[PDB]
Design a protein around this nucleic acid. Structure first.
Lengths: 149, 144, 129
RNA sequence: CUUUUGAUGUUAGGGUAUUGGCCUAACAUGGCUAUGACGGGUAACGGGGAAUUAGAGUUCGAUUCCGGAGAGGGAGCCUGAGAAAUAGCUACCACAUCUAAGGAAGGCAGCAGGCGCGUAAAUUACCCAAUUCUAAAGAAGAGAGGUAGUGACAAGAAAUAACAAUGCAAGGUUUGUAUUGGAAUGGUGGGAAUUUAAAACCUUCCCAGAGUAACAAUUGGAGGGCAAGUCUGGUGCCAGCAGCCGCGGUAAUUCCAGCUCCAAUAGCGUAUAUUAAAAUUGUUGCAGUUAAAACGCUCGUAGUUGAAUUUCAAAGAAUCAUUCUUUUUAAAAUCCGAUUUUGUUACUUUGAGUAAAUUAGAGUGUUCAAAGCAAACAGUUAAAGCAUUGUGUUUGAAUACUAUAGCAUGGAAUAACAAAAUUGAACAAGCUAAAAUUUUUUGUUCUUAUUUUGGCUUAGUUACGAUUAAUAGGAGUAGCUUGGGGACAUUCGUAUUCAGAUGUCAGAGGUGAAAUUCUUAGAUUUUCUGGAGACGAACAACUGCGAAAGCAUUUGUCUAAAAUACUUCCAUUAAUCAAGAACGAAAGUUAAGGGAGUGAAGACGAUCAGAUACCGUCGUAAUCUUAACCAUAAACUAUGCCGACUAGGUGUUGGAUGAAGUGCUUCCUUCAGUACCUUAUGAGAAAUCAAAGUCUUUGGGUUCUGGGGCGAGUAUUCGCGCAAGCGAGAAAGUUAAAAGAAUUGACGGAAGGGCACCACCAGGCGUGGAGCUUGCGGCUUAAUUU
RNA sequence: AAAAACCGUAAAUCCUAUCUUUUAAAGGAAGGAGAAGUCGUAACAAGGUUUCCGUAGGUGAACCUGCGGAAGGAUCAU
RNA sequence: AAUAGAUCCGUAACUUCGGGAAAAGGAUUGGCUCUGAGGACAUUAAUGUUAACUCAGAACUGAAACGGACAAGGGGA
């Protein structure tokens, strides 16, 4: 674990079978169409896959179609400009900063905000090392409130 | 781990750490601090010639009981006052009050030796005549 | 952070052998550890090991003959010229009649003796005896 | 830091032998730096090398050779191919010589030599014979250089005897051993040959030339370390010895001596420095719970380190039963079923350049050796070889090393970097712009165009093109999930205390006793009402949460975290981290408020010899809130963080799974916490430790800290702070122990047992009260012997 | 040829400033060593008030007291 | 009495960090002849018209003098 203690090994492990499940007679074209429609209606790719698994019964979209969900989302050109994890980290930091402004005596919230912004800076450094985030992107803490677009 | 970097490209840290830590033991500090020239009366010399100022008896430590016969020497190099132990049994009266004497270390570098407190030097010859050759047997000539 | 998978593999094998458990599971397999294991096998220090391939950088189960008494890695992988092979083996190996110091060389992974016999010492990997 | 005063660069020039901020002018604002710039120190000329080395290493290198620099300190200059020359010049500073006083002249860090300084270092010698340089170049010069002198700097060889007989001892007529008594031989003196520039030295030959072979070996020791005396005298805590432990006060194995013995030996001590010893500097290779040492905690940049994955393999000849050698098997360009290259670097392999001396090392009997680089062979004087008659012959002066960087080079492993999709290709066809070829107008000369190829646009075709999804990480989603996580507001409770009221009447508090104190104005006590500040018991745990500090009345809001579950997403985004940053008990500081209880200070009362203390009464600051500081605690599990592995059991906290007592509850499995017990052919010095294990069978990654004790966390400087102080942090001097764990004993105003009239209890008899005898002390004792 | 001037190279002297090293000093305040000195009893036993830490105040001295910690405690425990 | 304006340079202890400070302490300054920099306005990337005194630099010059009179801090421990 990045901060604090506790290994916490809880996770999800994919099955050995890498192919589409045999019972699934569904077609990749409508799978991608549904993913596009659902993203248009507006959800982050993680929860897109979540509702796809829960309500459409199509686990491991990579098995049904030979690529990843963010990959098709980008290929359609509608993927958001800020990755999911960075966006959620920014949102959390904005919320706790807003809370701190009213309650500046919350030393614990100050500490957690420092940790969150450290995570934001590390993650953004990685994302801009990749070409998928503009080089001048910095995340100054002032305009982050409206940075959520 | 081991407490030290083991990287193939971590020589700088190991070298810096050794360089800093070498200042911890007494031996290296003593032998590489420039203060020793300023401190010791010999300025790093093994021996030194000086002028006897006066003779003095010095108490031994508590477990022992003796009046060691030392002398006080004004060195010629710097005019520093030192105390030098006169070896031998009856050699104290065989040195004069203003005679020139050659003195050396007492065998433990800058440390006191034996029950004698604070004496780091011993005379080896007076009036260019060896105390050994002058006391152990009069095989050399007496005092000039 | 696992850093070196080979170090963990060799430590696990050494511990299992000292326990005398005749069969040991090495979780993070790799081609380097596979080559090291089959060199140990060719020199006869272990039995027939078997790699189980999931889609997750699979595991290895190795049969122990209770016959190796110390296998270990050398970290960092110092680069060794052909000249000081004899300088390092008298420091590492218990004797020069047995024991093997494993090198990675431009012509593959091999021990000190055949590294001598075909020249071109390389980087050091580990040892076993 | 540098940058006015050239610092970095551009442009132009000047200058130089040439390039260049080398300099000038204009312009620009650059250049270096925690990978340590700029400074400071060096008792620092660099290297070849030296000492010590098992391997690493550590220390030294003024000094044979190479390179640099200088000629008392600076500067300037002439000649010259070459000098910023110094036994060339000019000037200044400091020294200093002669002078008739007007003026002249100087530079030993060249060879000798002198003074001075010092612990510390040689002859005012001879010669150009060798090596070599200069010249008008055999022939002259050369304090270069060589020779000798002084020379225990070092280094090598090597005398101070050997032998025979009795006597003695040992042994089945063999060894050692006090007498004799003849040989051998140097040291030494002399002559000579020789050597040499001359001489000297060596070598050799001839005369003399050893018995106490007086032709005599010393230095340091004899308690241990450490080889060798409890032998004899002297001294008697003195003298002295002793590196350390120690010896010395009448038996001194230790001092001072004699004898003897030991060690080394023409050498042996001493002092200082250095190396090994020292795995006590630890890369190999230390230690950090308690011995010195894990930052209070977390974040975090530099640094260090980083999951897996892309070509695997198959077949054949040769020693012993194996080992060893060879061939091909995808795709694209090259050759009419065949001809042949297919990232970069680290790293590794080979070479080339590797000055000698030194080093390793081959050869070579300098009489050996240190050496040196020579030499060896037939030959009372000639055979042989070759030359078509004479001419010696055979040789050796090897080889390796010469960074880590640079040059070239084979390379399959291990490491990095490159290319790789909200896209990027390749091929084919048509289209467009240039080139090659050809033809060609035409009087030293003007067109043009045609066909093939390198590039642009445009339909179609490719196996067209994206590695897992880490018991790594992050994000997400779900739970009538969890929790004393945090902040704000809010609620309650009791006690205490204040005020009022209430009833009663002698005390009440407090102590081991007491006192101070309150009390007939009614204290303490009973009951009720209102206020105030504090705190949040019992539940409450070897329980929970938090990075640590820390966090327990109710409710609400805000906020975060963790575990669990997941066929959700991303795909290496990570670990640890100097600098830096956030938080950081209590006390303390600042300012407002609060102010019940407790209470550093203080005042009393006691105790005691004293009591400024422990005890009691009171009591200021503080404690509480708000807003700022401070940044420290035994901030402690005295145990840094991440990862892997290694064993059973008992629990317990929070989830998830499956089943069964009664929609409800227990058991099973599992994850994650959290303790405990046992066990270790695991560790440790041990206490002990499931980590403090997987460590001489030593290397998973990383950060910090320590190097005998005292001095000392002191002094001084810097940063921070309002201050208190905090962080960084010496040295001189002093010292042989300090320290850790455990064993036995002893002791305890420690606990638990047991025994005893030299203890008590039931008790009695007594002594000490009186007088007297007697012993001791003491009192003046020729003596009241002791 | 003297001589002079001007740029330049620039010794040397002086002033000022800073830095480095050495050193005097009334007085003050430490540390170490020595001796049978004086005063007390702080610690080691529950050391006779358990010891120790940080902080603050006080006192002839060791030391005492307040607040918050630790056991390295005299408790591994209804 | 001593400078004293302005420009350039340099500036300590101490400190309440604001100062001390014009600390202290240096250099220059005239005239003349020049050089460079700093703006505004119209025509089809380019050409003309025109203003302010303000700085910087260089030659030359003089009985080495130039804030030439006036005006105008003495500093430090």
């Amino acid at each position: 674990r990045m901060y604090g203690k506790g290994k916490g090994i809880s996770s999800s492990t994919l099955p050995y079978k890498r192919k589409q499940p045999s019972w699934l007679k569904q077609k990749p074209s409508e799978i991608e169409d549904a993913i596009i429609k659902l993203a248009k209606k507006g959800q982050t790719p993680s929860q897109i896959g979540a509702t796809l698994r829960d309500n459409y019964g199509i686990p491991q979209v990579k098995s049904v179609t030979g690529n990843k969900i963010l990959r098709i989302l980008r290929a359609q050109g509608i993927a958001t400009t800020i990755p999911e994890d960075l966006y959620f980290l920014i949102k959390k930091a904005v919320s706790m900063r807003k809370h701190l402004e009213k309650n500046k005596k919350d030393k614990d919230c100050k500490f957690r905000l420092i940790l969150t912004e450290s995570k934001i800076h590390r993650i953004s450094r990685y994302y801009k090392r990749k070409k998928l985030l503009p080089s001048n992107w910095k995340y100054q803490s002032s305009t982050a409130s409206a940075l959520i677009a | 781990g081991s407490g030290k970097p083991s990287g193939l490209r971590a020589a700088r840290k190991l070298r810096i750490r050794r360089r800093t830590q070498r200042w911890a033991d007494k031996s290296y500090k003593k032998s590489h601090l420039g203060t020793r020239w300023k401190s010791n009366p010999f300025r790093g010399s093994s021996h030194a010639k000086g002028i006897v100022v006066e003779k003095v008896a010095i108490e031994a430590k508590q477990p022992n009981s003796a009046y060691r016969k030392c002398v006080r020497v004004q060195l010629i190099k710097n005019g520093k006052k030192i105390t030098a132990f006169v070896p031998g049994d009856g050699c104290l009266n065989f040195i004069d009050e203003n005679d020139e004497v050659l003195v050396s270390g007492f065998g433990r570098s800058g440390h006191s030796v034996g029950d004698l407190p604070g004496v780091k030097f011993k005379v080896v010859k007076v009036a260019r005549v060896s105390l050994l050759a002058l006391f152990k047997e009069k095989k050399e000539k007496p005092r000039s | 952070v696992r850093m070196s998978v080979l170090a963990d593999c060799l430590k696990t094998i050494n511990n299992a052998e000292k326990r005398g458990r005749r069969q040991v599971l090495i979780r993070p397999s790799s081609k380097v550890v596979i080559k090291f294991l089959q060199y140990m096998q060719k020199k006869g220090y272990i039995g027939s090991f078997e790699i189980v391939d999931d889609h997750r950088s699979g595991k290895i189960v190795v049969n122990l003959l209770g016959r190796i008494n110390k296998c270990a890695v050398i970290s960092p992988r110092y680069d060794v010229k052909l000249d000081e092979i004899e300088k390092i083996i008298t420091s590492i190996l218990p004797s020069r009649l047995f024991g093997h110091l494993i090198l990675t060389t431009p012509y593959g992974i091999m021990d000190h003796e055949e590294a001598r016999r075909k020249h071109t010492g390389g980087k050091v990997l580990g040892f076993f005896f």
